[PDB]
């Protein structure tokens, strides 16, 4: 522990909305300090979303207005894409960083495959 709960795969409707779940059970004395979502481009994961001390940051204009990440429930950092495009198909990674009771940082990530169905 901690580990992220993320499905092996998610299928969403073309031009519709999709949720990529990413949750974890909050740990006593673990402080969430960073959330990232990444999209896989070959051997390189590419950050498309960052939540840090200054709030939320979408790093590509293609996503602004259609990428949102859950925030109301502690431990739920699921990603929602609206108006799903064919070429949103990819492996996506959810990544969370915490400060620990012993003063260190621990990171966990987990991969899902997003499929878009016509």
């Amino acid at each position, epitope marked *: *522990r901690p*580990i992220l709960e993320v499905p092996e795969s998610v299928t969403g409707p073309w031009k519709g909305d999709v949720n990529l779940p990413c949750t974890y059970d909050p740990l006593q004395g673990y402080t969430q300090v960073l959330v990232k979502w990444l999209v896989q481009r070959g051997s390189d*994961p590419v950050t498309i979303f960052l939540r840090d001390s200054s709030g939320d940051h979408i790093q590509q204009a293609k996503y602004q207005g259609r990428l949102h990440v859950s925030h109301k429930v502690p431990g739920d950092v699921s990603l929602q894409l609206s108006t799903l495009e064919m070429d949103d198909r990819s492996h996506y990674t959810c990544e969370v960083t915490w400060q620990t009771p012993d003063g260190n940082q621990v990171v966990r990530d987990k991969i899902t495959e997003l499929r878009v169905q016509k």
Partner: nanobody
Framework: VQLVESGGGLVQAGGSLRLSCAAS????????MGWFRQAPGKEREFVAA????????YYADSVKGRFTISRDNAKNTVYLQMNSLKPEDTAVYYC??????????????????WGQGTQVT
């Protein structure tokens, strides 16, 4: 899904074994792959891991330099080259698959599929 290890057995000190784990039932090129060990009594310890999407290698300090993880994605298999076998390495070694990408590869909890293990002495 099955993960099947092989290549262990009996050897004395300073020798070299080679472990292999054939993975059956997914395209495991998108899974991180890892090797763990459990000596009797001793709790299961992390040995080595290799990330999905080509990706990096990671090793325990106790086995580092001596051991080497590799993967053949066509064969859907992962390997562990073990040189200079100290007798404390006497354990069953298990291969495991998980959907981590670059972090948490040392955490047993991060792995969804486990092999039976190959006994090494």
């Amino acid at each position: 899904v099955q993960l099947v290890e092989s290549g262990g057995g009996l050897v004395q000190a300073g020798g070299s074994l080679r472990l292999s784990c054939a993975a059956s039932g997914r395209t495991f090129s998108s899974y991180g792959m890892g090797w763990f060990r459990q000596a009797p009594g001793k709790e299961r310890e992390f040995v080595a891991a290799i990330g999905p999407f080509g990706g990096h290698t990671y090793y325990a300090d106790s086995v580092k330099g001596r051991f080497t993880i590799s993967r053949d994605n066509a064969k859907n298999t992962v390997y562990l080259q073990m040189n200079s076998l100290k007798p404390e390495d006497t354990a069953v070694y298990y291969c495991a698959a998980g959907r981590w990408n670059r972090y948490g590869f040392y955490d047993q909890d991060n792995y969804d599929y486990w092999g039976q293990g190959t006994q090494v002495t």
